[PDB]
């Protein structure tokens, strides 16, 4: 993750300002709603038919969290995502069967979610040091599929 | 293909860009040339230091293009015909370059309209992003 | 969009394989699973050893599509309307694995059709792979 | 790049017996042929029109030998791709302005001439093996963009 001083710092201190809580299960809802077909590993948590069903469903919140926990704790290791990430790698590819596609497109819906939060703070630097933390992230990801 | 609620979440977010639309684009491609830098290699005869004229004025004419097409929803491989030719023929932009834009027109979009910008608007606005760009690359080949 | 001379070059070296379709989509399959892993998470259900007959069985499934495909050349979309239904609403594919899968066929049919695989006709299948890739990705949203 | 031992092998054995004048000459043609829009790059190159003409265009045949002369080079610095490419990538993006996006559509065109080349020796693992070379002399040729 070739990520300069001046890159890391951007990152870490916008991300002091995230509610983790709320944007995980925002960044996971409009993933299932823009790509509806990643609604197939989530057969399981209820209602996901409109919208309102999907961003309101307590369990898609509850796992966004989950996702967005992850991904704080790999912001701290950001010259080490394939080690932080190996566990959480093996599990999506033999458990859960994950084409790691979704990662990249969980990447930009979160991209879209923090400059829906951030607005003007978002600027296009900011955003060109999260495009390369997302990506390296879904390689993390995708590291140890075979 | 577009839905009417679609067409109706469409008209009613650009609706909103209104008289932004052109510093919309500009900032659409200056995020494009910094979180993508290949996408540069298109451009060697622009300016593309921050605040460039040629951008703002590059900027201005992607946002009438996507105003246009917004103007003719149901009828865009048509009112694009000629952008299509001049991508396909002149131009010659690789396909995959039209999602990194795409990308940074919703990042932009989501930067400047917070209340618009609901799921399903998101949505309905990726989807038709994704209609101009293949009519911009339906005549490649 | 697929050209009279596309038209003929895919029904051209589509007859060839005539009755090696079933054999070809196997070795596709095979192909793809091993240059591409990421493509096996939709299968985690089958036998993915070397000939083991999941893989045998879905590939003469895969090929007779296809023939379906080129004898419905003109008509494409409603041909295969109800493998799009089902790509889109059940199996669910990203849709960046139909080119990893069609890339695999050519492969396939440059390996096996020695000199029937000229440029034009390589331009032409590849061309043709895509219609049937946009057609069968055409209702996911 | 993460090649096997049996990988390494499995690139070099076929290598040693490609015709380099041949192949090169019909990888760049078939390039251009397959995928129009990269003939943007080679206007000099004369006329273009055809497939026909496209293949029998001389200097289509010279630059495909050098390229794949290149090509060559990487097989044998298979374990660091990167500096050996690195002053071929500054020239494809400071002097000559080339979309990576092209490197990778390259390496499957360079891919499919060899399986119609070698036909049944071309197997699915030695595939396999093709595809992640192609795609590190790519991502070499990629790695000093800007
Ligand atoms: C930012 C990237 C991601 C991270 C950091 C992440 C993290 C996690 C974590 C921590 C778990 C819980 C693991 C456990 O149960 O032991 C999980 C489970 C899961 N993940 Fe991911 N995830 C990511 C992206 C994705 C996406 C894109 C998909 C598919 C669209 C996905 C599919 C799943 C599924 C289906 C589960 C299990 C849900 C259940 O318990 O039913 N993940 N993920
Ligand atoms: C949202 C889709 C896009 C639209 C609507 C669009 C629209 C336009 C318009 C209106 C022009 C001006 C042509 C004129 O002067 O009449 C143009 C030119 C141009 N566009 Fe696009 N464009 C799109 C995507 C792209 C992308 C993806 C690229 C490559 C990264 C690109 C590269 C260019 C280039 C290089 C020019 C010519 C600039 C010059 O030489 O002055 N465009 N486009
Ligand atoms: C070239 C385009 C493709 C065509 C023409 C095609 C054709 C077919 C056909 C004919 C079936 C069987 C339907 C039935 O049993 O009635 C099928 C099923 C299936 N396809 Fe595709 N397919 C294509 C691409 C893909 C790709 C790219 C993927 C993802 C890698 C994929 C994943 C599947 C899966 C998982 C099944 C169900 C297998 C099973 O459970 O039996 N397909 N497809
Ligand atoms: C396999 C990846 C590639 C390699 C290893 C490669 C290598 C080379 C080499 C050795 C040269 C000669 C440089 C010199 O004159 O000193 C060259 C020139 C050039 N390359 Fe590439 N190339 C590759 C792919 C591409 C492709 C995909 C494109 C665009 C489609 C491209 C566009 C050019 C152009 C326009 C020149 C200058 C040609 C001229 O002299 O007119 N290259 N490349």
Known sequence: ?146 | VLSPADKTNVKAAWGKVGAHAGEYGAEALERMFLSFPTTKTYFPHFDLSHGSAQVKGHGKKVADALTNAVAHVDDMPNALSALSDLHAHKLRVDPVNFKLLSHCLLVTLAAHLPAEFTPAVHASLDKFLASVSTVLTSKYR
């Open chain 1, 1 to 146: 993750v070739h990520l300069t001083p001046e890159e890391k710092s951007a990152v870490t201190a916008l991300w002091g300002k995230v509610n983790v809580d709320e944007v995980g299960g925002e960044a996971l809802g409009r993933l299932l709603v823009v790509y509806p077909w990643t609604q197939r590993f989530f057969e399981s948590f209820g209602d996901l038919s409109t919208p309102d069903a999907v961003m309101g469903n307590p369990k898609v919140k509850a796992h966004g969290k989950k996702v967005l926990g992850a991904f704080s704790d790999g912001l701290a290791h950001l010259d080490n995502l394939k080690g932080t990430f190996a566990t959480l790698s093996e599990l999506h590819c033999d458990k859960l069967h994950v084409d790691p596609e979704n990662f990249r497109l969980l990447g930009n819906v979160l991209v879209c979610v923090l400059a829906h939060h951030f607005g003007k703070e978002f600027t296009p630097p900011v955003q060109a040091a999260y495009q390369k933390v997302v990506a390296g992230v879904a390689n993390a990801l995708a590291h140890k599929y075979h």
